[PDB]
C-alpha cells in the first residue's frame, strides 16, 4: 500500500560482514542471480508483452495465439538465410569435408521467405496483429477505423495529400464533386496574398503620403517637432521610387496618424498592415486605437523578424504576424478585436529602443522608410490597393462558372503575376496552394487546376475498397496478405466484400 | 449495502455471515497493493485478488452468481486508512446486479 | 540456468534446470576455489538445498510466465485471458412458476415448504402464500440444487407444511427454465475462446457467432455471409438472396433470447436467408420471430435455422494389449469427444464431420495401448434403424447444415 | 516445503513467518539438527537471505498473476492493454511560458529558478538566465513547477525570489503560453476502456439513436432500417434503396453537429437515403451533407430527414368545477404535455399520434376537478388555414415521419 | 494427439522393403498388419501431407 516493501536480499548482511570477502561474496552473487532471473526476467517479459514494442518474435507469436491469427504468412526467425542473388545475401553451401574455417561459400541457405503471401519485416507483424485486434473490436464504424489506422501507421500525425496515405472503408459516400471553400491567393511582389470574393475595404485615406501635410503628427509632450513625412527616392516593392521616410527628431515623442473615416465599427476584428524598410532604426511600433485607454500596441523588428512585444491595455489584442518581401522589405500584420467602436486612427512610431512605444523618448533623429499602409476589417491581410484620399472598396474576383471552376477577375492579371488555390474541387481536396494561371495582361478569366486524389464516389452498394501505399512505400507482401479475405485481419461487416489492393 | 468492519492492521482475516453465506476475507499488504483471499462456506473462492476502488473483488461469473453478492472498495485499498477513510461494502445479488448495470456504461 | 523461448512453435517458456553446476560455481570463487563441494558434507548439503530451491524458483516463474497465453493455462488464469475479451465461464439456476395448490381457505403456507416429485424432485417453496376462499391458489417454487430432473406433471407430495395444506399438482400451464452447468465449461472453454474471441465486437460474422454462442444452451453455431452476392451457393448451403447471412444454431435455447441476441448483432443491411428447402430447419417457417428493435421502431424479422439432426454409430476393433483391461471405457471416451470435453478438438458441431481417424485419436488420448484396428462410423438421420454393417465407412461428409449426435449405445467395441 | 503456492485459484502467498520457518527447517535438516540459526551467525545470515528470497518471488508472482484481466490491471500493463484500442495515457508536462516581459534596471542579471508567481498560486521557475539590456526591459522563459493546464493569463506577475534590480514581471499577449498536461490515471484508463466498449457494443440502429440523441436541441429520434433487399414502404417510409437505413431527427439542432454525430455512428456501406417524396423533409438539397472525418481529411456525405411539421388543433369543452380555473391554464398544460415537459408521457415526438384521449388525460393530469365533456384533435399542414368545425375528429393517427406542435392559440376551450 | 484442432479426412499407411521404390498411389491401405520379426521406420520424407 504505502509503508515501503523492502525485499532487498542484500538486507541479510549485518555490520559484522563488512570486511568479509566470503559471506558477503555469497550474498552479492546470490542477489545478482536473483536480480537477473526475477527483475531482468520480468522487465524483458513486460517488454515481450508490450505490443507497441515487440521486436522479439516470441511476443508476436504469443499475441497471434491470443488473437487467433494463422502464423503461416509471418516472417519471424532471424533473417539472412537465403542465397538468391547478391553479395548481401547467402551463397551455395557445399560439402566442406575438411571443415574450412570460412565454411565454404556460406554456412547455409534455404528458400525460407516464399513471397506473394508472406511478409518478412517484424515491424509490420505488429501492425497486422493490431489490425486484427481492431477488427476484433470493431462494430463497423468508418471514422473510427480511419482514426485507428492513422494512429497505428502514422502514429496519429496529419499528412499531406502529395503522399496519399490510408483512405476510407465501406461506405458508399462520394466525398465531393461540387466545389466549396475556395481560398484563392496570388503570387506577386507582395508574396502569397489571398483574394476576396465579397467586397473588401481599405479605410485609410492616403496610404502613400508624399508630403508632410498628407498626415498629421500628434504629440502630447510636444517637446520636439512632429515626425515629418518626406518623399524618399527609394525603390518601392511595387517598382517605383515613391516610398516615404519618417524621421523622429531628438527629444521628440511624436507619432504620425493617418486620417481615416471613423468609427470603424463595433465588435469587429481589424487588421493593420504596412511595408517597411530597415533604416537608421531597426524596428517599428504599431498601435491600434480603442476607447481611452483600451488601446493595443506592438513592436516589429524589421531585421530579425520577431514580434518581440505586443501589449493589450484591454481585451484588444488577438494576434501578430510578419511576412517577408524581397529587397529587404517587410509586412507586419496585427489582428485586434475590441467590443468598442472608438477606432479613430492607427498610430505608427519609429522606435528608438526595441520596446519603444508610440511615445517613447528619442535620443536622436531616427528615420525609417515606410510604404504601403493598409488598415482594414476582417482578420486576414489582403492585396495592396492605392488609396488617394479614399476608403477604397474592391472585389477581387467573381466565380462565374462553378463546376468547371473558371473564375472572372475585375482586371486582367498583370504580366508575370501568378495564382494559387486551396479547397476542394472535382471530388478532391487540396490543402495547399496550387497554381492555375500566370498573368498575361489581356485576359481576366482563368480556369482552375486539378487538385488531387481519386474521383471519390466509388459507386457501389454494400462494398468498397481501401487505398494506400504511395506514402508508406509498404511492402507488396503486406498488400498481398491483406487482400487475403480468409486470414480475417481486416475489420469488416458481414455482407461487405472490401478488397485492400492499391499501391 | 453492508459495510464490513475493519481494523488498521497490515494483514488480517475476517469471517462473517452475510447474504445467507459464510464469507471469510483475508486482506494483506503485498508489495504496494492489497491482496485479498476470499472463501465462501469453507471452500476457498479466490486467492491473491488485487484490490481496487469501485472494482468488485469477485470478478468471474463462476463466483458471484447466482445472487451471492460481491465486495467493493470505495477507494484504493490501504490498510493504513482502514476503519476511517476507506471501507469495504457488501452487495447482495440484486444490488450487485444494479451496480454492474450502472458500471457497464461508464 | 537459462530460459528457453520457443519462438513460434509452442509459446512456452521452458526452464533449463541444470542449476547445480551454476550454484557450485557460485560457491566457488566466493568461498575460495578449493572447496570440497562433494556431498555428505555441510557445504555439499548447502549447495544441494540451494540448487533445489533455485530450480523450484525457475519452475514457478516459468509457470507464471506461461499462464499469460492460453493452451497452457487453467482456472482463474485462463479465466483472466477470457475476461480480456469478455468471455465468461457461466452460471445458472432454474425456478418453476405457477404451481396449483388446493387446500383450505385462510391458511398461510410457510416459507421453505418441501415438495418432492416422484423421482426425488426435492423442490422448495421460496415465497409464502395464503389460500383464498376459492380453495385453489398458485405458488412459485425452485429446485434445491444445480440439477433438477424434469418434473412429470403429477400431484406433488407435501412433506413439511402447516395443518390444513391438502395437496399441490403440476400442469403444463406452469412455466419452466432449463439449467446449464458443470465447468458452463471447464476445459472446452479453451475451445470456446477462439469462437467468442470477438464478443465485444458487433456487426460482423465473427461477432454474430460469438454473441449467439454466448446465448445460454447454444452448443454450436454456424454463420455464412455470402458476401459475393450473386444468389449462387457459397461455402455450402444455397442462398436465395445475393447478400444475406445464414445462422445455424444448435442446442435448445429460448427462441426469444436467441432472437434478441441475433438482432443485437445485426450488421445493418444484411437480410437473413434460411430457405433452400432442406438447408437447415426453419425455426418458425416463413415470417420468423418478430422481436422488437431496442431503438424503438417496428417489429422486425430475424430468421435463423436449426441443424438437421443426425444419429451416429461407431464400430471399434481393439486388442486390449499391454495387459491393461478396459471393457467399456471406450464408448465413454467416444461420447466425451463427441460432446466436446476434450481440449483443442470441438466435438460434433454443425460444421463437424464424423471421422474414424478423429474417433480413434480421441479413444487413444483417453486410453493408450489398445492398438485400435477398425473404427468405422457411418451415420443416419434422426430416426431410421441401424445402418447395417454395409454402411459403416471411414468418414461422413456431414455438410455445413446438420449436427450429428452419438448415443452411449451407438458405440460397439470388439476385442480381438 | 514450498507447497504449491501457485495452485489454480490464483497465487496463494503465505506469511513471511511461515516462509522463514520453512527455510529454517530446511537449513536445520541440511546442516545439523541443532545448529544455531541466530541472525548473527553465518547460517542465520543465509537463512535471512533465503527468507527475503522465496518471498520477493511470492509477492512478484501474486502481483503479476492476473495481469491480463483489464478490470484489475495497473500501470504499464494497463497502458499496454489500452494501447490496443488506442487509449494512450498522456505525458505529464508543464506550462512553458515564453517571452515573459520583465522590467528591471541597468544591467541586472536574472538567474535560474527565481520562482515567479501568478496572482493565484501557480509558481513558475525561470529556466533561462538573462541580463537586462540598457533599455531596462527584457524577456524571459518560465516553466511551471507543477503539472497540468496551469493558467497563465495576461497580467503583471508577482516575484517570490527576486534579486536586486528586478522591478517586475508581466505577461504580454505576445507571450507564447504553452499548455501542459496532467497525465491520466488507472481509474480514468478503465473509464475510457468501458466507454470504448459501450461505443463498440452497439449495432447500427442503436448507435444512430444514441449518437443523434446526444446532440443538443434534439427532441427525439426515429431510426428505421430496411433489411429486406427490396424497395418498399415496410414501415412509414418507402426505402428508395434495397439496403439502407432512414433517420428522422426532431428539434432544431445544429446541422453540422448532427451530421458529424451521424457520421461517427455510421455503420458504413449501408448508405443513407432521404426517402421518397413526402417521406420527411429532405433538407440540404438532393445531395447529402458533407462532413470532414476527424480521422482523415477525407469527407463523407450523410443523409437525414427532419419530420414534416404538423399544426395540431385541439377543441375541449370542459365544465368548470367548484374551483375557478382559466382557459389559459388549460392551454399551458396542453402545450407543456405536447412538448413533453410532463413526467412519464413522452409527448408529441416524431412518429407519435395525436390522441384526444391522451390530451384529455394530460388535461385531467394537470387540472383535476374540472369535468371533461368533449375533447377533439385534428391535424393540418404548417402555414395552412385552421380546420373548419366538423373537420375536428375524435383521434388523429400520424405517420412515422411527422410531428405535431400545438401552441396556446391552437386550443379552443369552451366553458360549458 | 499432438496437434488437436486440425481435421483429418483420409489417412493411409503402407510398408515396403528397405531401399526399395516408394509404392505408387493406390497401393496404400487403411491398415497394414506386420510379421513378428520386423520394424517399420518412417522418416520426414516418408510422410505425404496434402492440405485440402
mmCIF file of N, CA, C and O in Angstrom, chain A residues 411-467:
data_model
loop_
_atom_site.group_PDB
_atom_site.id
_atom_site.type_symbol
_atom_site.label_atom_id
_atom_site.label_comp_id
_atom_site.label_asym_id
_atom_site.label_seq_id
_atom_site.Cartn_x
_atom_site.Cartn_y
_atom_site.Cartn_z
ATOM 1 N N UNK A 411 -9.965 42.942 -63.097
ATOM 2 C CA UNK A 411 -8.968 43.439 -64.028
ATOM 3 C C UNK A 411 -8.103 42.283 -64.503
ATOM 4 O O UNK A 411 -7.989 41.266 -63.810
ATOM 5 N N UNK A 412 -7.501 42.395 -65.688
ATOM 6 C CA UNK A 412 -6.638 41.312 -66.166
ATOM 7 C C UNK A 412 -5.393 41.169 -65.306
ATOM 8 O O UNK A 412 -4.883 42.138 -64.738
ATOM 9 N N UNK A 413 -4.915 39.937 -65.209
ATOM 10 C CA UNK A 413 -3.752 39.653 -64.380
ATOM 11 C C UNK A 413 -2.512 40.313 -64.975
ATOM 12 O O UNK A 413 -2.228 40.123 -66.165
ATOM 13 N N UNK A 414 -1.764 41.097 -64.198
ATOM 14 C CA UNK A 414 -0.545 41.717 -64.732
ATOM 15 C C UNK A 414 0.442 40.666 -65.214
ATOM 16 O O UNK A 414 0.519 39.560 -64.677
ATOM 17 N N UNK A 415 1.195 41.022 -66.254
ATOM 18 C CA UNK A 415 2.143 40.093 -66.855
ATOM 19 C C UNK A 415 3.157 39.606 -65.826
ATOM 20 O O UNK A 415 3.982 40.386 -65.338
ATOM 21 N N UNK A 416 3.098 38.319 -65.491
ATOM 22 C CA UNK A 416 4.018 37.709 -64.552
ATOM 23 C C UNK A 416 3.428 37.360 -63.202
ATOM 24 O O UNK A 416 4.053 36.591 -62.460
ATOM 25 N N UNK A 417 2.256 37.883 -62.854
ATOM 26 C CA UNK A 417 1.625 37.541 -61.584
ATOM 27 C C UNK A 417 1.080 36.123 -61.680
ATOM 28 O O UNK A 417 0.682 35.667 -62.760
ATOM 29 N N UNK A 418 1.080 35.404 -60.561
ATOM 30 C CA UNK A 418 0.629 34.021 -60.549
ATOM 31 C C UNK A 418 -0.565 33.861 -59.617
ATOM 32 O O UNK A 418 -0.847 34.722 -58.784
ATOM 33 N N UNK A 419 -1.251 32.731 -59.755
ATOM 34 C CA UNK A 419 -2.416 32.417 -58.945
ATOM 35 C C UNK A 419 -2.215 31.088 -58.229
ATOM 36 O O UNK A 419 -1.412 30.250 -58.642
ATOM 37 N N UNK A 420 -2.953 30.915 -57.135
ATOM 38 C CA UNK A 420 -2.935 29.685 -56.359
ATOM 39 C C UNK A 420 -4.321 29.469 -55.773
ATOM 40 O O UNK A 420 -5.049 30.423 -55.494
ATOM 41 N N UNK A 421 -4.674 28.205 -55.568
ATOM 42 C CA UNK A 421 -5.969 27.872 -54.992
ATOM 43 C C UNK A 421 -5.806 26.815 -53.912
ATOM 44 O O UNK A 421 -4.868 26.015 -53.940
ATOM 45 N N UNK A 422 -6.742 26.830 -52.962
ATOM 46 C CA UNK A 422 -6.811 25.850 -51.887
ATOM 47 C C UNK A 422 -8.280 25.598 -51.571
ATOM 48 O O UNK A 422 -9.082 26.537 -51.556
ATOM 49 N N UNK A 423 -8.635 24.335 -51.350
ATOM 50 C CA UNK A 423 -10.010 23.994 -51.044
ATOM 51 C C UNK A 423 -10.378 22.578 -51.436
ATOM 52 O O UNK A 423 -9.688 21.625 -51.063
ATOM 53 N N UNK A 424 -11.469 22.427 -52.184
ATOM 54 C CA UNK A 424 -11.921 21.117 -52.632
ATOM 55 C C UNK A 424 -12.698 21.270 -53.932
ATOM 56 O O UNK A 424 -13.595 22.114 -54.023
ATOM 57 N N UNK A 425 -12.356 20.453 -54.927
ATOM 58 C CA UNK A 425 -12.986 20.531 -56.238
ATOM 59 C C UNK A 425 -12.832 19.188 -56.938
ATOM 60 O O UNK A 425 -11.891 18.439 -56.664
ATOM 61 N N UNK A 426 -13.775 18.892 -57.837
ATOM 62 C CA UNK A 426 -13.737 17.682 -58.663
ATOM 63 C C UNK A 426 -13.640 16.418 -57.817
ATOM 64 O O UNK A 426 -13.034 15.426 -58.229
ATOM 65 N N UNK A 427 -14.247 16.436 -56.634
ATOM 66 C CA UNK A 427 -14.106 15.319 -55.725
ATOM 67 C C UNK A 427 -12.660 15.116 -55.324
ATOM 68 O O UNK A 427 -12.113 14.023 -55.482
ATOM 69 N N UNK A 428 -12.016 16.178 -54.852
ATOM 70 C CA UNK A 428 -10.641 16.088 -54.406
ATOM 71 C C UNK A 428 -10.218 17.304 -53.610
ATOM 72 O O UNK A 428 -10.544 18.435 -53.980
ATOM 73 N N UNK A 429 -9.490 17.087 -52.520
ATOM 74 C CA UNK A 429 -9.082 18.164 -51.630
ATOM 75 C C UNK A 429 -7.647 18.581 -51.915
ATOM 76 O O UNK A 429 -6.793 17.748 -52.234
ATOM 77 N N UNK A 430 -7.391 19.883 -51.807
ATOM 78 C CA UNK A 430 -6.054 20.449 -51.971
ATOM 79 C C UNK A 430 -5.836 21.436 -50.829
ATOM 80 O O UNK A 430 -6.218 22.605 -50.928
ATOM 81 N N UNK A 431 -5.221 20.960 -49.748
ATOM 82 C CA UNK A 431 -4.955 21.790 -48.582
ATOM 83 C C UNK A 431 -3.771 22.725 -48.778
ATOM 84 O O UNK A 431 -3.432 23.471 -47.853
ATOM 85 N N UNK A 432 -3.141 22.703 -49.946
ATOM 86 C CA UNK A 432 -2.005 23.557 -50.243
ATOM 87 C C UNK A 432 -2.258 24.325 -51.530
ATOM 88 O O UNK A 432 -3.000 23.862 -52.402
ATOM 89 N N UNK A 433 -1.670 25.513 -51.663
ATOM 90 C CA UNK A 433 -1.877 26.302 -52.881
ATOM 91 C C UNK A 433 -1.426 25.550 -54.126
ATOM 92 O O UNK A 433 -0.372 24.911 -54.146
ATOM 93 N N UNK A 434 -2.244 25.637 -55.171
ATOM 94 C CA UNK A 434 -1.939 25.036 -56.465
ATOM 95 C C UNK A 434 -2.065 26.108 -57.535
ATOM 96 O O UNK A 434 -3.056 26.844 -57.557
ATOM 97 N N UNK A 435 -1.056 26.208 -58.398
ATOM 98 C CA UNK A 435 -1.051 27.226 -59.440
ATOM 99 C C UNK A 435 -1.963 26.831 -60.595
ATOM 100 O O UNK A 435 -2.026 25.664 -60.990
ATOM 101 N N UNK A 436 -2.686 27.816 -61.131
ATOM 102 C CA UNK A 436 -3.523 27.569 -62.298
ATOM 103 C C UNK A 436 -3.499 28.675 -63.341
ATOM 104 O O UNK A 436 -4.149 28.514 -64.378
ATOM 105 N N UNK A 437 -2.792 29.782 -63.121
ATOM 106 C CA UNK A 437 -2.783 30.863 -64.095
ATOM 107 C C UNK A 437 -1.556 31.737 -63.884
ATOM 108 O O UNK A 437 -1.112 31.934 -62.751
ATOM 109 N N UNK A 438 -1.020 32.257 -64.986
ATOM 110 C CA UNK A 438 0.061 33.235 -64.971
ATOM 111 C C UNK A 438 -0.395 34.444 -65.773
ATOM 112 O O UNK A 438 -1.025 34.299 -66.827
ATOM 113 N N UNK A 439 -0.084 35.636 -65.270
ATOM 114 C CA UNK A 439 -0.630 36.843 -65.865
ATOM 115 C C UNK A 439 -0.154 37.046 -67.294
ATOM 116 O O UNK A 439 0.993 36.754 -67.638
ATOM 117 N N UNK A 440 -1.059 37.554 -68.132
ATOM 118 C CA UNK A 440 -0.740 37.934 -69.499
ATOM 119 C C UNK A 440 -1.098 39.375 -69.829
ATOM 120 O O UNK A 440 -0.596 39.900 -70.829
ATOM 121 N N UNK A 441 -1.945 40.024 -69.029
ATOM 122 C CA UNK A 441 -2.259 41.424 -69.202
ATOM 123 C C UNK A 441 -3.464 41.722 -70.068
ATOM 124 O O UNK A 441 -3.967 42.852 -70.029
ATOM 125 N N UNK A 442 -3.947 40.754 -70.845
ATOM 126 C CA UNK A 442 -5.081 40.968 -71.731
ATOM 127 C C UNK A 442 -6.261 40.057 -71.427
ATOM 128 O O UNK A 442 -7.311 40.198 -72.066
ATOM 129 N N UNK A 443 -6.126 39.135 -70.479
ATOM 130 C CA UNK A 443 -7.188 38.206 -70.127
ATOM 131 C C UNK A 443 -7.459 38.285 -68.632
ATOM 132 O O UNK A 443 -6.536 38.474 -67.836
ATOM 133 N N UNK A 444 -8.732 38.136 -68.257
ATOM 134 C CA UNK A 444 -9.128 38.162 -66.858
ATOM 135 C C UNK A 444 -9.964 36.961 -66.434
ATOM 136 O O UNK A 444 -10.363 36.890 -65.267
ATOM 137 N N UNK A 445 -10.250 36.029 -67.337
ATOM 138 C CA UNK A 445 -10.923 34.786 -66.992
ATOM 139 C C UNK A 445 -9.913 33.647 -67.032
ATOM 140 O O UNK A 445 -9.050 33.596 -67.915
ATOM 141 N N UNK A 446 -9.978 32.770 -66.033
ATOM 142 C CA UNK A 446 -8.975 31.718 -65.908
ATOM 143 C C UNK A 446 -9.595 30.481 -65.281
ATOM 144 O O UNK A 446 -10.285 30.582 -64.264
ATOM 145 N N UNK A 447 -9.347 29.323 -65.884
ATOM 146 C CA UNK A 447 -9.881 28.073 -65.365
ATOM 147 C C UNK A 447 -9.035 27.562 -64.205
ATOM 148 O O UNK A 447 -7.830 27.817 -64.123
ATOM 149 N N UNK A 448 -9.684 26.836 -63.300
ATOM 150 C CA UNK A 448 -8.997 26.268 -62.151
ATOM 151 C C UNK A 448 -8.248 24.997 -62.540
ATOM 152 O O UNK A 448 -8.502 24.384 -63.581
ATOM 153 N N UNK A 449 -7.319 24.603 -61.679
ATOM 154 C CA UNK A 449 -6.478 23.437 -61.904
ATOM 155 C C UNK A 449 -6.955 22.258 -61.065
ATOM 156 O O UNK A 449 -7.619 22.418 -60.038
ATOM 157 N N UNK A 450 -6.598 21.064 -61.520
ATOM 158 C CA UNK A 450 -6.987 19.847 -60.823
ATOM 159 C C UNK A 450 -6.281 19.774 -59.474
ATOM 160 O O UNK A 450 -5.048 19.861 -59.423
ATOM 161 N N UNK A 451 -7.000 19.588 -58.331
ATOM 162 C CA UNK A 451 -6.339 19.362 -57.035
ATOM 163 C C UNK A 451 -5.617 18.007 -56.975
ATOM 164 O O UNK A 451 -4.438 17.970 -57.274
ATOM 165 N N UNK A 452 -6.327 16.940 -56.587
ATOM 166 C CA UNK A 452 -5.690 15.609 -56.431
ATOM 167 C C UNK A 452 -6.720 14.489 -56.640
ATOM 168 O O UNK A 452 -7.138 14.279 -57.795
ATOM 169 N N UNK A 453 -7.154 13.845 -55.552
ATOM 170 C CA UNK A 453 -6.840 12.433 -55.203
ATOM 171 C C UNK A 453 -8.077 11.546 -55.373
ATOM 172 O O UNK A 453 -8.908 11.572 -54.442
ATOM 173 N N UNK A 454 -8.206 10.831 -56.505
ATOM 174 C CA UNK A 454 -9.294 9.889 -56.752
ATOM 175 C C UNK A 454 -10.608 10.636 -56.955
ATOM 176 O O UNK A 454 -10.863 11.662 -56.314
ATOM 177 N N UNK A 455 -11.448 10.128 -57.862
ATOM 178 C CA UNK A 455 -12.725 10.769 -58.106
ATOM 179 C C UNK A 455 -13.592 10.853 -56.862
ATOM 180 O O UNK A 455 -14.278 11.852 -56.648
ATOM 181 N N UNK A 456 -13.612 9.765 -56.048
ATOM 182 C CA UNK A 456 -14.100 9.633 -54.661
ATOM 183 C C UNK A 456 -15.458 8.935 -54.552
ATOM 184 O O UNK A 456 -15.662 8.173 -53.608
ATOM 185 N N UNK A 457 -16.480 9.107 -55.435
ATOM 186 C CA UNK A 457 -17.726 8.329 -55.310
ATOM 187 C C UNK A 457 -17.517 6.817 -55.138
ATOM 188 O O UNK A 457 -18.129 6.273 -54.235
ATOM 189 N N UNK A 458 -16.693 6.181 -55.984
ATOM 190 C CA UNK A 458 -16.561 4.717 -55.911
ATOM 191 C C UNK A 458 -17.929 4.031 -55.827
ATOM 192 O O UNK A 458 -18.257 3.341 -54.870
ATOM 193 N N UNK A 459 -18.718 4.274 -56.873
ATOM 194 C CA UNK A 459 -20.112 3.862 -56.869
ATOM 195 C C UNK A 459 -20.256 2.364 -56.653
ATOM 196 O O UNK A 459 -19.558 1.560 -57.279
ATOM 197 N N UNK A 460 -21.161 1.999 -55.759
ATOM 198 C CA UNK A 460 -21.383 0.602 -55.430
ATOM 199 C C UNK A 460 -22.262 0.466 -54.208
ATOM 200 O O UNK A 460 -22.389 1.408 -53.422
ATOM 201 N N UNK A 461 -22.871 -0.698 -54.034
ATOM 202 C CA UNK A 461 -23.745 -0.958 -52.903
ATOM 203 C C UNK A 461 -23.151 -2.082 -52.073
ATOM 204 O O UNK A 461 -22.778 -3.127 -52.613
ATOM 205 N N UNK A 462 -23.039 -1.846 -50.768
ATOM 206 C CA UNK A 462 -22.627 -2.850 -49.795
ATOM 207 C C UNK A 462 -21.212 -3.361 -50.038
ATOM 208 O O UNK A 462 -20.885 -4.490 -49.662
ATOM 209 N N UNK A 463 -20.359 -2.553 -50.661
ATOM 210 C CA UNK A 463 -18.980 -2.951 -50.901
ATOM 211 C C UNK A 463 -18.162 -1.712 -51.221
ATOM 212 O O UNK A 463 -18.638 -0.816 -51.922
ATOM 213 N N UNK A 464 -16.943 -1.666 -50.700
ATOM 214 C CA UNK A 464 -15.999 -0.611 -51.052
ATOM 215 C C UNK A 464 -14.588 -1.176 -50.928
ATOM 216 O O UNK A 464 -14.390 -2.393 -50.982
ATOM 217 N N UNK A 465 -13.601 -0.292 -50.793
ATOM 218 C CA UNK A 465 -12.214 -0.674 -51.010
ATOM 219 C C UNK A 465 -11.273 0.341 -50.371
ATOM 220 O O UNK A 465 -11.601 1.524 -50.250
ATOM 221 N N UNK A 466 -10.095 -0.141 -49.966
ATOM 222 C CA UNK A 466 -9.087 0.681 -49.309
ATOM 223 C C UNK A 466 -8.310 1.501 -50.339
ATOM 224 O O UNK A 466 -8.554 1.426 -51.546
ATOM 225 N N UNK A 467 -7.349 2.290 -49.855
ATOM 226 C CA UNK A 467 -6.412 2.994 -50.732
ATOM 227 C C UNK A 467 -5.185 3.345 -49.902
ATOM 228 O O UNK A 467 -5.310 4.051 -48.896
#
